[PDB]
Structure formats: structure tokens, C-alpha cells
Design a protein around this ligand. Structure first.
Ligand code: PMP
Ligand code: PMP
Lengths: 412, 412
């Protein structure tokens, strides 16, 4: 029940040519495009009510504050948190995950404790844990993957022990398209006395998030992936855990009393927001949320399911293409052409107007698991169409034809 | 030689009324306004070439990358650094100062080492040092102020000893208007074997920065104070120091190899930029720099000197007003009306259209030093005029008249 033509009309950037062809943007997992509602929200902020926030002593100051804290409430309702105290604005999912690793992990890990992650994790959800286990002499472990790149709950029960303090796992893999059984993993973590930390950078833009239903302890997302400004994200954490964490960063705005040598902190959420905050970006993230909610996340999810089933079908009609990951998936396809390096694939597609990704996708352990150096990836969003998937598979067909010809021509 | 009318024409936000009066924005030390060149830079980015950066595999990706790294070069030239490797984009001065406290201070401080700051420092340049000395068992010391809120170099030579590892000091105080003798303090620090860390949040918008001439080891600034987007700042550090610091944050983008348990880092500057970066914000900061450079920082500085000398004169014509700090100053005046709380002052000014600040200005140790709870502050920028300073002092006169009347009327 969504109109794709009307949705595409709201995204100015879509209406242009690259190299003579109509742009075909299939790289939303790398970053999403913004509708006018979001860009005009930033314009209006800078044109009319920019001022510093949380003073409320002059009119613009009050309007800026109302917009910024108003956006916090919009985030709270968007992921179904209980309280704005549980919503911290950060620079992005990466920073959010680093805050947990710093303030939670490095304060609660002793030799013998385990942090458990998975082989499919983006680097954002790997490196902070490597550093934290190293600083504390704890142990890092990995939940194995099944043959189709999904996670077995039995493997989770086996990897997670009563020494596990943290489970950290992706909601949705940007590479495999896997949707992980987050809710069941939260119960397992909790049964062993662990917290679960969810990397929700790739789920939040594309499907309904309910932190009450997932019962996740921490949940991280990035504005830039969900039609919102760059430079902003959210750390959600259960209020009782956030209350016992020390700040990751220190400065003005996040203090209550400052003496010469000692300071006390503001209450949540401001405790974790040091310094002048990301005012225009958070307000534009609020606009992005109003925009996605007015279309409906279920509708968005339904659209992407239809794009992904269509793409999987049309890829299986191509000879000499491998697709990675399961059948039931988020709106993306990572793949390789036999004998064409994915970098060349992406380069040739760009000559056809088509924007994809090639490389390790910040998942180098997953690439080794897949037994490859690199792959190509197309990812979908609410502005993409089946016609665009046709152009993609038609271009892959011609790419295959072209590279096979060059080779035969170079058989001189 | 700058035209203020033509400069004001470029700032849409200035042209409105608040409470029936023309807006008089005198709160640029809290945050600056943006010209069209900056707002349209963000529009054009989101309307035409938003994409993820540092892949350069498709056309928009390449344009986004060229804009983002192009902005890095603009920052480098703007502060006269030697290399883009010395320019890290961060969330703001606060984050920048926290990075030094985390990666430099907490790795190089042992019991017996001193970190030396001053009583005039913003919280951003206090709390990170409090935490770092506490984590390492080092010692925090404070350079005293003279009676006019300036720093004596003799006091610096006395506070800084051969156990001092870090001197951290404001370039320009947001409260006193003091311009600190940064260059001479760098020599003293260096003679004792210390590094100097400069908080340049309040200097960078308003006067020419030359990190070669200052010989500062680290220098921090915020976009939002200098006509640029919120949410972005810079950490400059001498390349040889940055090369020996570990990252403050870990994740994708800032790695080279990721194994299961160990990782290696990118070269500078990317080593310190974890995760998708502040793409649109950094590009708009580049626009802000082109805009300020086209007016000329010396011209901006000259204008503010004339506003500040005018304001100091016209304040001294008011009865029962105290102004804090020295005669030679940056473009701002912090003050109190005898017997009117600064909060009431700022509230009454807003009813006249006039936007100032009241409170501790994130300098609680300085407020105790001044022997007050709070003050009011007006701050100037390149769009402000002497007519606006007249309205301010006329309004302070009427505020004084009004509060004195209420009191006499309440002498019933
Ligand atoms: C002197 C000074 N130092 C530090 C800061 C903190 O900068 P930010 O809030 O942009 O991180 C400010 C901000 N008004 C400042 O004026
Ligand atoms: C699954 C996943 N996790 C983490 C990240 C890192 O997010 P950011 O770069 O926005 O910090 C991404 C970003 N593409 C992602 O897709």
C-alpha cells in the first residue's frame, strides 16, 4: 500500500544521470538518501532557530532546545524505549558501541569473563570488544555460523557460558542479509547472567524496532542509514544499566558540580552527552523518523521483502554468479561473478549509472569465513524498484559477456 | 574594509522579530549563525552527491569523498598545519580534548607527573584532565590569574615544573575575553619537557590561527562557533605525537587488518576516524572556512576589536554594572547588574528581542574565582553592529530602571 513513484519524488538526489545513464542507486547499506522533509528540516533549523540548547533563556534558545529534546522523544517512541533517559544521541552506531565497550565492558570485565560475538559482525561490533578484552585480560569468543550464514540457537547456548558477561551481535548483517534471532539470544544471555548488546545499524532503517520485545540491554543505530543526517546516531541502554555506567566523555553540558579536582554528573541522558550536542543532525533525525513512520516500517519491510525475493530469483537466472547468505533475508544481495573481481564489477556498473559496493564491507572475518577476499553488494531501500533490479541483472549479464569477450580476444 | 550590511544579508536567521522587536543576536560565544554559503553547501550535498566516502567505486561515492577530504585540506590551510595527517575531524572541541586526555594523557602519565591547567578554563578543558590524573595517580595543578583575569608568564614558569607532562590552556576565554600568551606558554611547556594542548574553540572563529607560529602540540576547535554545521570539530596534533597515540575509538574505517582477536590501524588521519564520518558537516565546515577566508580573519578580528572597545566604553557609561576581565580582549563582555540576577537580565533582554547568555558559562571554577554565582554575557561576531550594542546598553539601562521601580513600588 505504499506508492514508490510518490516516494521517489521526495528524494531529489535520485533524479540525475551518471555517465549518461539514469542513476540507479543500489548502495543504501553503505548510506541512504534523504527526502526533502529531512533536508528542509535542516534548512529551517539554520535559517530560523539555530541557537545553543538547554539554556532556554532567549526565544531561539528555547526553540532549538524544544526541537532537540523533541527529537529525543521521537527516537524513544520510534524504538519503543520506556524513557528518554534511555536514549543517548551519539555520532553513530560505532561511537555508541564504543561507549558500551568503554563504560560497561572495561569496568565490568575481569580475567575469566567472556565477551561473545559472531563471525558475521561488522568491525564496529568487533574491534571495541577486542580492545576491551585486552585491557581487562578477559576472553573473546565467537558463535559459529551455519552453512547458509545463519546462527543456530544451540550454538549460542554452547558458546555462551556462565562466565559470559557480554553477548554482542548484529540485528541484521549488512553482508549476508541475515536477520538474527535477537529476542531468543537475549533470553540465553540473560539466563547466563550476561547483557546483550545489539548492533542495529542495518535493522533500524528497514524494519520495526521494539526494544521492549527484543529485551536487548543496549541497542545502537546510525541516522545516516535511515534517511537522516550524517554524523548522528543513538545508543539505547536499559535505564538501570546506564545509571551505573560512568560517562565515556567529559566536559561541559554533562556535569552538575565542577570543583578544582572532582566533578559530579548530570542525570540521564545528559550524563552521556558531553559538549555542545549535534543539534541540527538530531532534529533532522527526528524528521527522518516522522517520515519513515508516516510510510510505516511494516510497509517498508514488506516492500524490501518483495525486492529481495525478486532479486534472489533474478540472480539465480544468471550463470556463474554466487550469492551469499540465506533465503529469508533483509533487502540486499552480496555476490560475486565467477572470474570477475568485484571491484571491476562495481566499476563497470557505475559506467551504466548503477551504484553498488565492492570490498570487505568492514567484515573481514566474515570474508575469510566465506573463503573470499571481497564481494560485490547491492542493497535496497524504500525508493528502489524492480525495474532497478532488472537493470542490475541486465548489467551483470553484459558485464559477464564483456569480460568473457576480452579474455577470448586476448587469447591472441 | 568589510561591509557589515552585505555580511548580514548572507545570514537569513538575522532577519526576523522576537516578541515584536527586531532580533538582536548577541550570543555567538554560545553558538554562531550560518551564512547561505554554508546552508546551501549542505543542501547541495544531500540533493546531489551524498554517498559513503573512501570507496570511490561509483561516481557519487567519488564526489562525496572528494568533498570530505577536500574539506580536510581547507582546514589544514586554515590553521596552517603542515599536513592533512595532523587534521582529525571530530564531533567538536570537547571530543577533541577528550581524545588527547584518553590517548595521550592516560598513556603517558605516572604518579609524580603533573597536568597543569588554569582557573579560567571551560569545563571541556578541565574534566578530561581531572579524569586522566585520577586514572593514572598523577597530579592536577592550576596556574593562578592576575587581578584583571590575565595570565602572567612568571606564574606559568612557577606552576610548570620538570615533572609537568601536559600544559592545557584556553587560547581565548569565552568568559573574560582574555587572549592568553599561547606562543610563550608553548616555549615554557617545551622547556620543561611538557606538551601544550590549546583549547581554541573561542579563538578559531574570530582570529587567524597559525599552529606553526603558536608551536602548540594539540589544538581543538568547534565548527558550530565559526559559521559552520553543528556536530563537527577538529583535533590538530603534531604528526609525530599522533603517530605514537593509540586510537580513542575503534571500528570500521580506522583499521587496516582485522583478525579474530587483533587488528592493525590505518595511517593518519583515518586512524582516529572510526565509523562512517561526519560527511555533510565536514563539507559544510569547509564552506564556512572558505566564507570566513574570503572576508579575511584579520578583518573579522579588526571588526570585533572595534565592537569590543565600543561595548566596554558604553558599559562604563552605565551605573551599577560590573564588567569582568581585561581591557584588551576578544569580542565579548561578561557582566552583572548590581542587585539584578543575570537570569532576569537575560529574560528581560529577550522581551526586547535581544539574545544573550546567563549562568556559569561552563566555567564554574572561574565563577568562584570571580566570587559570583553567575553572570550575563554578550558576545559578538562578524554580523554584529554598534547599533546592536546601543540597543543592548539602552535595554540594560531600562532593565535597571525597571527593577529599581518594582522594588520602590514593593516598598509598600
Ligand atoms: C572556550 C571553549 N572551550 C570549549 C568549548 C566546548 O566546545 P563544544 O561545546 O563545541 O565541544 C566551548 C564552547 N562554547 C568554548 O567556548
Ligand atoms: C551492521 C552495521 N554495523 C555497524 C555499522 C557502522 O555504522 P556507522 O559507520 O554508522 O558508525 C554499519 C554501517 N554501514 C553497519 O551496517
Amino acid at each position: 500500500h505504499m506508492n514508490i513513484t510518490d516516494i521517489r519524488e521526495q528524494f531529489p538526489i535520485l533524479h540525475q544521470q551518471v555517465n549518461g545513464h539514469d542513476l540507479v542507486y543500489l548502495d543504501s547499506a553503505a548510506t541512504s538518501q534523504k527526502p526533502r522533509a529531512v533536508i528542509e528540516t535542516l534548512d529551517k533549523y539554520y535559517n530560523q532557530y539555530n541557537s545553543n540548547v538547554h539554556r532556554g533563556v532567549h526565544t531561539l534558545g528555547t526553540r532549538a532546545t524544544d526541537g532537540y529534546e523533541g527529537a529525543r522523544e521521537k527516537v524513544r517512541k520510534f524504538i519503543n524505549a520506556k524513557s528518554m533517559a534511555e536514549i543517548i544521541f551519539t555520532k553513530g552506531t560505532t561511537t555508541s558501541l564504543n561507549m558500551v565497550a568503554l563504560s560497561y565492558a572495561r569496568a565490568n570485565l575481569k580475567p575469566g569473563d567472556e565477551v561473545v560475538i559472531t563471525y558475521m559482525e561488522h568491525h564496529a561490533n568487533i574491534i571495541p570488544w577486542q580492545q576491551a578484552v585486552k585491557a581487562t585480560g578477559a576472553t573473546l569468543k565467537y558463535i559459529p555460523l551455519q552453512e547458509d550464514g545463519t546462527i543456530s540457537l544451540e550454538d549460542v547456548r554452547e558458546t555462551v557460558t556462565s562466565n559470559t558477561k557480554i553477548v554482542a551481535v548484529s540485528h541484521v548483517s549488512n553482508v549476508l542479509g541475515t536477520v538474527n534471532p535477537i529476542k531468543e539470544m537475549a533470553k540465553i544471555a540473560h539466563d547466563n547472567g550476561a547483557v546483550i548488546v545489539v548492533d542495529g545499524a542495518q535493522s533500524t532503517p528497514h524494519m520495526k524496532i521494539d526494544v521492549q520485545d527484543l529485551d536487548c540491554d543496549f541497542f545502537a543505530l546510525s541516522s545516516h542509514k535511515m534517511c537522516g543526517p550524517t554524523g548522528v546516531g543513538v545508543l539505547y541502554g536499559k535505564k538501570a544499566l546506564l545509571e551505573n555506567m560512568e560517562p565515556a566523555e567529559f566536559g561541559g553540558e554533562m556535569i552538575d558540580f565542577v570543583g578544582l579536582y572532582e566533578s559530579t554528573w548530570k542525570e540521564l541522558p545528559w550524563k552521556f552527552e558531553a559538549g555542545t550536542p549535534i543539534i541540527a543532525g538530531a532534529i533532522g533525525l527526528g524528521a527522518a523518523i516522522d517520515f519513515l513512520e508516516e510510510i510505516g516500517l511494516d510497509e517498508i519491510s514488506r516492500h524490501e521483502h518483495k525486492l529481495a525475493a525478486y532479486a534472489l530469483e533474478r540472480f539465480r537466472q544468471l550463470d556463474g554468479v554466487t550469492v551469499y547468505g540465506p533465503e529469508e533475508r533483509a533487502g540486499l544481495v552480496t555476490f560475486n561473478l565467477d572470474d570477475v573481481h568485484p571491484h571491476d564489477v562495481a566499476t563497470v556498473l557505475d559506467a551504466e549509472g548503477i551504484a553498488v559496493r565492492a570490498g570487505h564491507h568492514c567484515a573481514q572475518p566474515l570474508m575469510k569465513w566465506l573463503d573470499v577476499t571481497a564481494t560485490a553488494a547491492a542493497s535496497f531501500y524504500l525508493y528502489n524498484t524492480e525495474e532497478e533490479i532488472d537493470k542490475l541483472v541486465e548489467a551483470l549479464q553484459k558485464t559477464k559477456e564483456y569480460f568473457t569477450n576480452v579474455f577470448v580476444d586476448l587469447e591472441h
